[model samples]
Target: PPFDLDAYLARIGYTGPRNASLDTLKALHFAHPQAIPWENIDPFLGRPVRLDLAALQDKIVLGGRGGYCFEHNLLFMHALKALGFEVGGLAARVLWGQSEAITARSHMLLRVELDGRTYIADVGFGGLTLTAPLLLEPGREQKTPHEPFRIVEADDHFRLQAAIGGDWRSLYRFDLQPQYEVDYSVTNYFLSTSPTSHFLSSVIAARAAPDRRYALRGNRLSIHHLGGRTEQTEIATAADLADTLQGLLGIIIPDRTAFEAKVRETKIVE
Candidate 1:
């Protein structure tokens, strides 16, 4: 199935230029995560995630639903290719709050080449997604709409860090090695199906706005403002969670009965 450029542009409310230049790329990158959202409803409900173009379109573009990393980046890669950008897949080992040991490259992102330069574009990471494309150049701090990011280059890999509350925190690590669709399929299956996969244990959804980031894990909702104020709310009822997902996050729930039951079953351990 071919990627639907018009539908995707419409879904993301992107009315800017469609050129593959840096301006277009930055506009699209900024518009996407804010519009489409970051959600794991399918994997959270024990449903298999489909990464094919048509299925991705049906779920994200047409169905008004959102998905996890693999789904979002795959669709984005297709869109970028169609628009004449030299785009390829890259994987990352998520280091956010995890151990420093090397881990599986489970996180998916993009390597985009434009105007003889390279940039990393990611719109799928929950909570702390990059709202703008980042220059592949390391060391120098880059300012985005939300936060400042810096890339640190090690022997063979690059570590991404975000400036949070005056402290630099690691987000993920990756290299320039190219990745294939099959690679993402394998990791996506394990993350979405494996019993021990943490994604299945929580109802995670996130959206980034101009001023704040909305994050939901189970019944807890946290709104992080750009000016360093974070307000937390505990959603006590299934109905409340549903409202937040739909009203606040713009995620269209496909199944209500099962979703409500899952919400009621959610318990956040302190």
Candidate 2:
């Protein structure tokens, strides 16, 4: 089947302009994370993470579920292409929650060419996902609906940072080199299968809401409101985890028994 543009647009509840303008790009960027969310349940359970366009549409758009960076961005890239946007894939090395040492380009992002200026559009960085398309220019802080983000050039590459708690936190590093679907598929296979991968060992999900952001790791759930307030709670049991995943996070669990068992046995060390 062809890419169902109408279904994706409905999934995001976006009825705005469909042209490849900056406004349309920003509108889709803001609506995607809120609609599809961010989650790694398949990888968390040691299942294969599918990256094909049809699988992405089946899972995220019509299947009432969410996916991680590769799935989200790939699906979003297709949506953008369907709407006449010139988009290409880019990969980033993970830096958040890790040391400054160089790492693998395991993350996926997008590069959009609009009006002779390139913009970065990513809606798949877990809890700190971008809610707006960012200009490719470096050294200036770009404010989104949730938090202010900025990109800085370093050694011919670019580093994306977000201003959180009034401090700049580096998320990832990448160059303008284009990435292909096979690249993401290879990384996805490694992350989903490698025992050392955190996604295989932990449950993580995030969503950017209208007034707050929700982050869940293992059995702990936290809500970061835009008003500078944070609330954290520990999920005590499988039932609680199920409720939290479905109710607060808006993700549909495909396998209840296995997922519940995984949640019951998974431990949070922080």
Q: Write the per-residue lDDT of candidate 1 for residues 1-270, one digit (tens) a residue.
A: 778899999999998888888888888888899888899888878888998888999999998899999988998888899899999999999998787598788899999988888999998887599988999999979999999999999788998999998899989999989999899989998999988798988888999998999999888899999978999999878888888999988988888788888766765322
lDDT of candidate 2 vs native?
0.89
Looking at candidate 1, what is the lDDT of residue 259? 84
Q: In candidate 2, list every pair of residues with a backbone clash.
A: none
lDDT of 1: 0.89
Residue pairs whose backbone atoms clash in candidate 1: none
What are the lDDT figures for the candidates, one per model?
0.89, 0.89
TM-score to true structure, per model: 0.96, 0.97
Which portions of model 2 miss their true places by more than 4 Å? 268-270
